């Protein structure tokens, strides 16, 4: 009864709205906090786009090797990897890595493009039993996280279940699941979010997200030493539109729900 008491003060002291879903695969217990409220996904949505492509590749053998042109026109606000390939190409594999590991926003757009637009990414979620996920826009506007808006949202519960299906279950074939885990395990943007609330010794594969209204999110699969893995989704959003990011809130939330 404490664990939920502690998350609620974190929420107060942090002055925001906090969503949490933990899945302990050791006994399939869950910890839920507003786990059925909608939250602007922001970049944590890149995991579903990369997954949708991977799924496709299972019936398009070398889909991951198809070349995709990067045009100067394509660049948006955050383009750390694509910017190096303008008037060149990137493979779908390279765009998946870049989207997942550096949060490259051109890469996402390319992923969205090659599955059929945001509605079909959503359609892929439905294929997975996720009836909550909805991708409605492209980069960069899908990060507005305006309150009460439902575009580009999901619920902590639905995305932890989905992320377990994708990284540990059988949503993807063995090869594609392994690729997603290696990509996520290779994220460079997560060191201050879920990760910072765990023992430094644990292995983490995570995808951060951030957007307007101070919205700071992270979604992770976690392999502690000598334990069964966890799936943890932390979503955090704030009232004022200009609020600064609070990755530390995700770290505290992870700390609270992993204590014990
Ligand atoms: C997903 O929201 C998020 N960021 C973006 O989509 C960009 N608009 C952006 C990224 C980085 C800096 C500035 C803007 C992922 N990018 C991660 C990062 O590199 O720090 C993140 C933690 C900002 S999330």
Numbering used by the authors: 28 to 287
Q: How does the study describe this entry?
A:
In its trans-enamine intermediate, the C2 atom of the lactam ring in ampicillin was covalently bonded to the hydroxyl sidechain of Ser70. The backbone amides of Ser70 and Ser237 generated the oxyanion hole that stabilized the position of the negatively charged carbonyl oxygen of the acyloxyl group in the acyl-enzyme intermediate. Upon superimposing the apo- and complex structures, significant conformational changes were observed for sidechains of several residues in the binding pocket, although there was no altered position in the backbone of the enzyme. The carbonyl oxygen atom of the ampicillin amide group had a hydrogen bond interaction with the oxygen backbone of Ser130. The nitrogen atom of the same amide group in ampicillin was located within a hydrogen bond distance from the hydroxyl sidechain of Ser70. The primary amine in ampicillin, which differentiates it from the parent compound, penicillin, was oriented parallelly with the sidechain of Tyr105. In addition, a parallel p–p stacking interaction was observed between the phenyl ring of Tyr105 and the benzyl ring of ampicillin. Two methyl groups of the penam ring of ampicillin showed hydrophobic interactions with the methyl sidechain of Thr235. The sulfur atom of the same penam ring did not display any specific interaction with neighboring residues, although the bridgehead nitrogen in the penam ring showed hydrogen bond interactions with the backbone and sidechain of Ser237. The carboxyl group attached to the penam ring was within a hydrogen bond distance from the guanidium sidechain of Arg274.
Cefotaximase-Munich (CTX-M) extended-spectrum beta-lactamases (ESBLs) are commonly associated with Gram-negative, hospital-acquired infections worldwide. CTX-M-15, which belongs to hydrolases (EC 3.5.2.6), cleaves lactam carbon–nitrogen amide bonds rapidly, deactivating β-lactam antibiotics. To understand the mechanism of CTX-M-15 activity, we have determined the crystal structures of CTX-M-15 in complex with two specific classes of beta-lactam compounds, desfuroylceftiofur (DFC) and ampicillin, and an inhibitor, clavulanic acid. The binding pocket of CTX-M-15 for those β-lactams was established by the residues from both the α- and α/β-domains, surrounded by the catalytic residues Ser70, Lys73, Ser130, and Glu166.
